[PDB]
Amino acid sequence: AYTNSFTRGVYYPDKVFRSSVLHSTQDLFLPFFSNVTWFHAIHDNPVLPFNDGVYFASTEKSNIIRGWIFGTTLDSKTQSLLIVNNATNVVIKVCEFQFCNDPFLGVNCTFEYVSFKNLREFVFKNIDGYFKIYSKHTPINLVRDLPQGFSALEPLVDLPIGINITRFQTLLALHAAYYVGYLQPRTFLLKYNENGTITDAVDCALDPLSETKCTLKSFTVEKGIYQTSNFRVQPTESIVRFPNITNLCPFGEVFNATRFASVYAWNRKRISNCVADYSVLYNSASFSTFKCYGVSPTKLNDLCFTNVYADSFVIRGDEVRQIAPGQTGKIADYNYKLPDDFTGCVIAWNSNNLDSKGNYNYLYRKPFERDIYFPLQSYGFQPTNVGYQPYRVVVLSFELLHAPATVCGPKKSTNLVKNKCVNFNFNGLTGTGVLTESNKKFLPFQQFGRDIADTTDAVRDPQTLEILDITPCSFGGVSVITPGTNTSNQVAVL
Amino acid sequence: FELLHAPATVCGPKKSTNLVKNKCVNFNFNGLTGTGVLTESNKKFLPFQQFGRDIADTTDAVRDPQTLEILDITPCSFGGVSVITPGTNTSNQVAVL
Amino acid sequence: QNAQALNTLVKQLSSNFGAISSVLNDILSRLDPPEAEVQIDRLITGRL
Amino acid sequence: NGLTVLPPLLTDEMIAQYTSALLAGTITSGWTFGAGAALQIPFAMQMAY
Numbered sequence: 248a249y250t251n252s253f254t255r256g257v258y259y260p261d262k263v264f265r266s267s268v269l270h271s272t273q274d275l276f277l278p279f280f281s282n283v284t285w286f287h288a289i290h291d292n293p294v295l296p297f298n299d300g301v302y303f304a305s306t307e308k309s310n311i312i313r314g315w316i317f318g319t320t321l322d323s324k325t326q327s328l329l330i331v332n333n334a335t336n337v338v339i340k341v342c343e344f345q346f347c348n349d350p351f352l353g354v355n356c357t358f359e360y361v362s363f364k365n366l367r368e369f370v371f372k373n374i375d376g377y378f379k380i381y382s383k384h385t386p387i388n389l390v391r392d393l394p395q396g397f398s399a400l401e402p403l404v405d406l407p408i409g410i411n412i413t414r415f416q417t418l419l420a421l422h423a424a425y426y427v428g429y430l431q432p433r434t435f436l437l438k439y440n441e442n443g444t445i446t447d448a449v450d451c452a453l454d455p456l457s458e459t460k461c462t463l464k465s466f467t468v469e470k471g472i473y474q475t476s477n478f479r480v481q482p483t484e485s486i487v488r489f490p491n492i493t494n495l496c497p498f499g500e501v502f503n504a505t506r507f508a509s510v511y512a513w514n515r516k517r518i519s520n521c522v523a524d525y526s527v528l529y530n531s532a533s534f535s536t537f538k539c540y541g542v543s544p545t546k547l548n549d550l551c552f553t554n555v556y557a558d559s560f561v562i563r564g565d566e567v568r569q570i571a572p573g574q575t576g577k578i579a580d581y582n583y584k585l586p587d588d589f590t591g592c593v594i595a596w597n598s599n600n601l602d603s604k605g606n607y608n609y610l611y612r613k614p615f616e617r618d619i620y621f622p623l624q625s626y627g628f629q630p631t632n633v634g635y636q637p638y639r640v641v642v643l644s645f646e647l648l649h650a651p652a653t654v655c656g657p658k659k660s661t662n663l664v665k666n667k668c669v670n671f672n673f674n675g676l677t678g679t680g681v682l683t684e685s686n687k688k689f690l691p692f693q694q695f696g697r698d699i700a701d702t703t704d705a706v707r708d709p710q711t712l713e714i715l716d717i718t719p720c721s722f723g724g725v726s727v728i729t730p731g732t733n734t735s736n737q738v739a740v741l
Numbered sequence: 742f743e744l745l746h747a748p749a750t751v752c753g754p755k756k757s758t759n760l761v762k763n764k765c766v767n768f769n770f771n772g773l774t775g776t777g778v779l780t781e782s783n784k785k786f787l788p789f790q791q792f793g794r795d796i797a798d799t800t801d802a803v804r805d806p807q808t809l810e811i812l813d814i815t816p817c818s819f820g821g822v823s824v825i826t827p828g829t830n831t832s833n834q835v836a837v838l
Numbered sequence: 839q840n841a842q843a844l845n846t847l848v849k850q851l852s853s854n855f856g857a858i859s860s861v862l863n864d865i866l867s868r869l870d871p872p873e874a875e876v877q878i879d880r881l882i883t884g885r886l
Numbered sequence: 887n888g889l890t891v892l893p894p895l896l897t898d899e900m901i902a903q904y905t906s907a908l909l910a911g912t913i914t915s916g917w918t919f920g921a922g923a924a925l926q927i928p929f930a931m932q933m934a935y
């Protein structure tokens with residue numbers, strides 16, 4: 248069984264006093280006129296999903312509903328919030344309770360507290376570990392269903408339980424119907440009266456007149472046409488395209504090399520025509536540092552490059568800080584310079600247990616220049632020297648210019664769907680639109696096309712060299728044609 | 742630390758002072774500061790509400806943390822000041838509005 | 839005059855305004871939120 | 887980019903109908919249609935005025 252939520256399930260969203268104002272708010276409310284599941288207690292206490300949050304309501308004549316259970320398994324295997332109201336004493340506990348196969352009341356704990364004719368409404372939500380309880384009790388004269396009307400709920404309790412709640416169950420007193428409605432992130436307009444009591448409400452996503460009340464900040468709408476929204480078509484599925492290459496990039500040949508070059512004569516290895524899995528380098532605990540100046544290290548798996556170069560050499564530990572864009576010093580200026588617009592990551596680890604002996608084979612002296620009483624000096628690295636120990640540093644320089652990408656990370660491609668609105672990813676380039684066949688003659692060296700706004704106009708599919716046009720999915724202003732609200736609540740939409 | 746405007750349970754080491762009504766004062770309520778005249782009010786804060794706010798998000802009223810009564814906050818009198826003057830080639834006497 | 843005003847407005851989308859890229863998707867696909875937000879604020883200020 | 891153009895309320899055809907009405911009025915009734923009713927007048931007499 249299901250019923251109509253109507254206008255029930257709005258609560259005072261904050262401890263801020265307001266009056267005579269049409270204030271607007273976004274919080275997890277019950278959506279207006281949505282369905283709520285209707286349960287019965289005659290001649291029904293199942294476990295329900297909690298989802299993003301719950302409105303709960305019940306109707307009483309004899310105080311049958313006395314409690315709630317919240318958790319994931321509700322079987323003593325996890326912590327579960329228990330609320331019970333027996334006679335005049337409200338009891339709250341969050342123990343790893345052993346609940347019955349079918350919990351009811353007859354007629355490692357982290358918290359404990361002890362204190363139809365009646366409608367008792369509640370709101371439960373679980374935000375960053377905080378279980379927030381709002382409620383309202385009101386007299387009623389109705390047995391069949393939830394009464395229609397409006398009256399908002401105050402917040403009463405906020406329990407810092409830190410419990411992951413996915414399911415909940417109620418507790419009945421056996422010798423009282425109840426409703427369960429899912430909260431959603433719907434913006435509201437709320438009529439605070441002179442006393443500051445919310446006396447009316449308008450759900451924004453209910454219907455086009457309600458959008459118009461949300462747009463004008465008014466419960467009354469004048470005769471006219473109002474631009475409430477922009478209609479935009481949504482995509483269906485994502486499309487991921489990368490060259491179908493299975494070769495793996497030789498990072499091991501750079502990072503696990505028998506010998507590193509000196510900084511005065513640093514090596515520059517080209518990485519191309521391969522799959523670059525950067526999760527290995529990032530997750531590895533062997534590195535003393537992994538600092539990215541270009542892109543974030545976790546994005547490297549999706550993103551891909553025209554080329555990647557690995558600059559490999561040995562420096563003294565205290566000089567690691569100098570290998571960065573914007574830095575100056577005797578190393579940054581004299582022997583190894585990066586562009587100040589450098590894109591990439593600097594990875595380094597000590598070699599105190601490998602290169603140190605003393606080891607005098609390491610000598611030091613524009614961006615990416617190799618400069619092959621003298622300017623030439625060297626180090627004697629010994630195992631007994633931290634800031635004076637040798638470090639192996641590899642600088643990964645990434646070229647992200649829009650051109651055919653030779654280095655693309657470990658991500659599987661999908662099939663391509665034409666003439667449908669889709670979320671696409673071509674060699675790390677993303678966007679949303681309709682991919683169609685085209686007559687745009689890209690030259691063999693061209694990979695991407697562009698519009699006046701510098702947005703992508705067309706792309707060359709990286710697996711099959713054909714050109715696809717990108718046209719954003721149909722969109723436009725909505726407008727609501729409405730007579731006076733007094734004349735009618737009926738509306739028409741452009 | 743949760744600094745959301747709500748009743749404070751943990752307050753910093755600092756002695757309170759007496760409260761003076763109907764005079765321009767520099768106030769501090771639970772760490773919330775400003776300047777204005779504190780007066781008696783008829784604003785019915787709900788038991789869970791500690792602060793009230795205006796359209797500008799400025800404080801409209803507060804609940805005194807020691808004695809649970811509501812005080813309205815009216816910013817201390819201010820206004821533009823204009824000088825009415827004949828040209829200085831006639832007189833250096835002025836009137837002030 | 840109106841055509842020129844619109845063409846100018848559209849061309850401004852190609853400007854970086856101090857950001858690493860004029861393309862919003864390229865910022866988002868490359869930077870984590872704590873850094874992406876800075877680059878985006880630069881574009882928002884310029885475009886607004 | 888979000889840049890659109892709205893149509894005018896009065897289409898070119900409707901404007902043409904208005905200029906036609908104003909012109910037909912001017913020719914067959916002089917200025918009388920401006921003040922009140924369109925009062926037919928021989929064009930040559932209208933010019934005399």
Ligand SMILES: *[C@@H]1O[C@H](CO)[C@@H](O)[C@H](O)[C@H]1NC(C)=O
Pocket residue numbers: 249281282
């Ligand atoms: C609510 O349930 C009825 C069936 O009783 C169904 O026809 C209606 O579409 C449902 N509405 C929503 C919003 O789920």
Ligand SMILES: *[C@@H]1O[C@H](CO)[C@@H](O)[C@H](O)[C@H]1NC(C)=O
Pocket residue numbers: 333334335336338
């Ligand atoms: C309510 O339950 C508690 C146990 O959680 C029990 O100690 C108490 O006696 C019960 N009821 C009353 C009215 O005290």
Ligand SMILES: *[C@@H]1O[C@H](CO)[C@@H](O)[C@H](O)[C@H]1NC(C)=O
Pocket residue numbers: 343355
């Ligand atoms: C309490 O938690 C600990 C984990 O720190 C666990 O080992 C122990 O078994 C739990 N106690 C019970 C009664 O399950």
Ligand SMILES: *[C@@H]1O[C@H](CO)[C@@H](O)[C@H](O)[C@H]1NC(C)=O
Pocket residue numbers: 440441442443
């Ligand atoms: C506010 O409360 C008073 C009772 O104190 C009541 O008479 C009035 O109708 C209520 N509504 C207003 C004025 O907001």
Ligand SMILES: *[C@@H]1O[C@H](CO)[C@@H](O)[C@H](O)[C@H]1NC(C)=O
Pocket residue numbers: 498499500502503527528531
């Ligand atoms: C270097 O060798 C270690 C094994 O000792 C391995 O775990 C690591 O992934 C290798 N590094 C690279 C870049 O392949």
Ligand SMILES: *[C@@H]1O[C@H](CO)[C@@H](O)[C@H](O)[C@H]1NC(C)=O
Pocket residue numbers: 490491492709710711
């Ligand atoms: C993609 O796979 C096809 C075989 O189905 C092959 O002919 C084509 O060359 C591959 N594309 C790339 C860029 O490697």
Ligand SMILES: *[C@@H]1O[C@H](CO)[C@@H](O)[C@H](O)[C@H]1NC(C)=O
Pocket residue numbers: 806807808
């Ligand atoms: C402040 O002190 C009074 C006694 O003068 C006491 O009754 C009141 O409860 C105290 N307020 C708080 C918030 O503790």
Ligand SMILES: *[C@@H]1O[C@H](CO)[C@@H](O)[C@H](O)[C@H]1NC(C)=O
Pocket residue numbers: 830831
């Ligand atoms: C203004 O004052 C000057 C003296 O500095 C005098 O020469 C001049 O005539 C005066 N003009 C008027 C209009 O009073």
